Design a protein around this ligand. Sequence first.
Ligand code: ZN
Length: 1270
Amino acid sequence: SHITILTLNINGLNSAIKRHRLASWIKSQDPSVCCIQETHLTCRDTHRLKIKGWRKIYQANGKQKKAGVAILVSDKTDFKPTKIKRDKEGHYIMVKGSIQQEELTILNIYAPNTGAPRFIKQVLSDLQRDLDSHTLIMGDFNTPLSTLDRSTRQKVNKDTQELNSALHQADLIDIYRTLHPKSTEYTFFSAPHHTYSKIDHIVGSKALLSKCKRTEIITNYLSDHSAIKLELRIKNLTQSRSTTWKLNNLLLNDYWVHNEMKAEIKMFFETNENKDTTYQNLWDAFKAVCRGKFIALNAYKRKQERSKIDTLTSQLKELEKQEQTHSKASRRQEITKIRAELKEIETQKTLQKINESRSWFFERINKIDRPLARLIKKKREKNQIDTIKNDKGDITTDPTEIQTTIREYYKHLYANKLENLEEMDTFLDTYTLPRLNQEEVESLNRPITGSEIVAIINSLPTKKSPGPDGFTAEFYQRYKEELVPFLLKLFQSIEKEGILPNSFYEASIILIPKPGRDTTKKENFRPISLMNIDAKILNKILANRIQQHIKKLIHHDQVGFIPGMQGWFNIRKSINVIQHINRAKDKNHMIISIDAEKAFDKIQQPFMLKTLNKLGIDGTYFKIIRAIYDKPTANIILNGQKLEAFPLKTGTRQGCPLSPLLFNIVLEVLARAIRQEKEIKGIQLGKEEVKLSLFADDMIVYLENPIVSAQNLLKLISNFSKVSGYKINVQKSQAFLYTNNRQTESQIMGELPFTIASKRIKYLGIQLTRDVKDLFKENYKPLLKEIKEETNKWKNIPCSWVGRINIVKMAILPKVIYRFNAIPIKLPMTFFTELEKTTLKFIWNQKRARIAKSILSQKNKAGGITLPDFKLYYKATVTKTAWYWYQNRDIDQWNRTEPSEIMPHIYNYLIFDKPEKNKQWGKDSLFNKWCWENWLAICRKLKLDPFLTPYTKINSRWIKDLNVKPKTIKTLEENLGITIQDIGVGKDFMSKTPKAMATKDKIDKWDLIKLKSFCTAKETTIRVNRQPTTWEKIFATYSSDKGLISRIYNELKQIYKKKTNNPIKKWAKDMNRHFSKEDIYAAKKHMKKCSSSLAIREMQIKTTMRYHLTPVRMAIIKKSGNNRCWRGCGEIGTLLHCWWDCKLVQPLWKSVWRFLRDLELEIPFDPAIPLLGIYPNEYKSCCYKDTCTRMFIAALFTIAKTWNQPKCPTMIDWIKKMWHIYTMEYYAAIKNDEFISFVGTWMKLETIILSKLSQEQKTKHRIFSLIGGN
DNA sequence: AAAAAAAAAAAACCCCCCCC
DNA sequence: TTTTTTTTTTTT
DNA sequence: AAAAAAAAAA
RNA sequence: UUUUUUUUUUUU
Ligand SMILES: [Zn+2]
């Protein structure tokens, strides 16, 4: 074990290019401690010095840029700071701490150019209290210490003699001189004297000499100073930071890497396959060899990308050593030239990397993506853990104790395994469970095919962290066309044998701190399990196979992880139950929210296997399931260190795509046990018996007569947990009590161990209320409070208005949509007006709405930027229930639990059905009546007939009013169809197919007469045989509810097209011109299509929508006569003047038009073309639209930069904007494989720009040729 | 009689880009 | 000049 | 019928 | 810093 400390004078850290030079340089050496002198920074600039992998940065700076120091500690160093102090002027900084339980003090000092020895002596005198045997004083001393430190072999002056005497007094010696008495290496070059001297020194107490190993001076190209590396021996307390290898996506994207990697895979699979080894061990060897080859390719890539750098570095070292031996001017000139060339090439490399990053950020500058989501989101808490309460009860910091305690805790969590199989079988036998038939069990046991593997791999989410092997989903996706055969062979092997590779058993658990909880307690840490991609592929194949039948295996009461089943089914059902209990004249009911204590990790694997056997699952599928849970294990990745693996004897392996389905199956045994237990009394809502409802492990149990029912439920829960491990926290589980006598409530409190909430309980993020009359108060008022709180949090968020529009869509809209879905009750207009005011105040940053919310409320015709309409989303959510009304699915028990004292089955007969017979129904209804009222509202708004439609069901009242026998109506439904159009009307009555007369043959004559009398009537014929609009198709055609809210919202937006002013027509009025509909369509399309990135579209939206503010507008606002044009003209300051007719902006437009003339484009000098994108009918050619679009948008950016600045906007700024967009779009295109289009649209523009730019401006603005004729 | 659409009146805050 | 809010009228 | 992103619940 | 389900938005 050794510690490396590096010193370096750098002479400024202000250039954004220069700081990245530090990041690459420091990471290249990878030292334990790196210190920086002469940062040329102030106090307020400390926030800018951030380096990846070095989180411990201590910066001391003054009020002016004359000095500055910093001490940095790498993340791989076990450093515990103890004392930190900073000099006022930033000339020096010292940090004292313990590395591997050994004291070490670092004093980084940047001496002044004049009087350095006196300053160093004063610093030593001031720091005498901190000096010790483990204290190092080092940095730029600006003076040699010995004769051998000068190339001229000259003695030191009197000041340096005083400094040496002070060092001797302070018991300090030169470590570098002691280790290398005859060394002549130098770090500084004095230009006026043409001499070399060593002015950077490291000194310390002689006690450290017992640990000193070696030291050297490594010359640097960063500045004129040379770095010094000191290596010291330390006690062997090294942390085993063997970071798990991971396959980054950048390495995969390289074509040469792709070719060599596929060649290596092919060669391995052609040589290392045989009859003597199984496919599992061969697959493990394949993974190991792939990891080795990937490491080798990454290493050679790192070597080749640094080939020229390394060559110039070697030449620099040779010339520097020769100069140190004897100084010559020619060698100095050669060193200067080669250093300049190397600096230029490395600066180009840094520009390439930073431009890649900036283009990635710019393509998603304001879109719905990571840069915005992480912008609004709070800074993610570090996963490193430094303090955990141990088993004894003491607060400890020792990393080995923390690791041992956390590993023992997570091992004991998964080690409680039960072996009582007899009790398991008895419990499974006691209560009936569904069984799959032969067809479904053969569907499960069907062989795996290559197409299934391709579909599974193509569905794998990307950008997800890999498992222990470090192989990501992109590895399988890119190499799929070679990986399907051998993955298929492996899967056939595991089907035949039932043995999985050892990689399928290992998982990586990462600990995440729970927000709002104590991070010093081990029990407030969320365990997240990561799996290898192949294991996830197999598990997801099995999950899909069992998901094809999970509808039969799982009752509809459980909605978690069930496809086509939505969470709010339980919320609405629970609210309806609460309403019924409230309406009951005598209250003897209980509603429990069972809080399971880590149910996912407490389900016994043997119980899972026994349950799967009892459900009729056998063959290859059950064998594979057993093989998965044969020897599972996981290891905790704590502080980046892989801990010892511990077995998963019990619990279901999280992070597995198949795990939720297995947990649902296991919990369904308990669910059916509760439902089939007659001693547990549910709540009877007419013909619907409601006992319990499930969402994953979250369970709600409704009971009647709780005194006996709750005890029976607890007894059955204990019996279930004795065989499955499903432990519940009964003392924490919240519940309601509804009792008509307080003594009974007290007795129930005494007997039961549940805790009863007086007002609300949380359930699926929804605050269920004891009295449903307070649903709005307990669910929507806090919603507005939270929305206002987040708005205030993002009051000064650094984004434009489109960024905040997308923020509203991305963070506020989903929560509001979910709350609407859960509780779509009649909401007063006050709530919506407050929500709209809060959102709008957020959007415009407390300013007035520059662009009317009515314009942005429109579709993409407003510019592809939509402001969310919360009223329309509310209406869509309310009307969504009508779809479930029409479908009348048997699994929708939530819709049949609405209280009603009349018309028990009505909700299936409103959609496309005769109106109620003047019956006042749903008086106490909470969700259905409002949905019906809204449905009628939109139906009347459409001038539509909502009572008879081509989609009217056969089961509808339109045929049941004719006293038709049931058997006839079932026959019609089964043989013909669902809608009346299938039967036929008028001349088409039962005549659209020979099957029509066939079914007529087995129809009762009276019912057939009634059907003929009804269908052939003229009114029915016209009302049926008409083309249905989109609104009818939304609720009748699709049998799937996926994307229902989107379609209803789009249709409602089309319906509620409020009249809006068209500001493009206002623009036309400004320039005394009239635009046709073609011109407006072209302007809108240009606004939507201006550029792929959102900033350019935002600029075009701002200029076309008259977002920018005009001087006459201000004169009117202030009610004053100061309507004169800004920047000084003497003319009126209208918007068209500010954009086009301004005398101070005309030269820029003349330069632009000269550029178009150089493009051989005779575009007329008409402001519509650049300001709005409207082209004359004579210039419909699209071979140049993109180029001129980019030039005009850059001109608009430049003009907007100088909106009121009296200076004329300059052509060089316009070219600078061109090159900013050039870099952004080029790197976006090279990332998106759009090279050909990018060249085709900017090649001539780049040529013209380079021809019109002088060499000095090109060099100073980093403008140069970047693409070729490729 | 209640809900939805339209018209009239009033009040706003002299830039605009930039900013991960 | 443009936007939002309130008020008045009309229709279901 | 694909890709990407977010959010909600567990 | 996973897994599943559901929901929305944008780009064809
Ligand atoms: Zn002007």
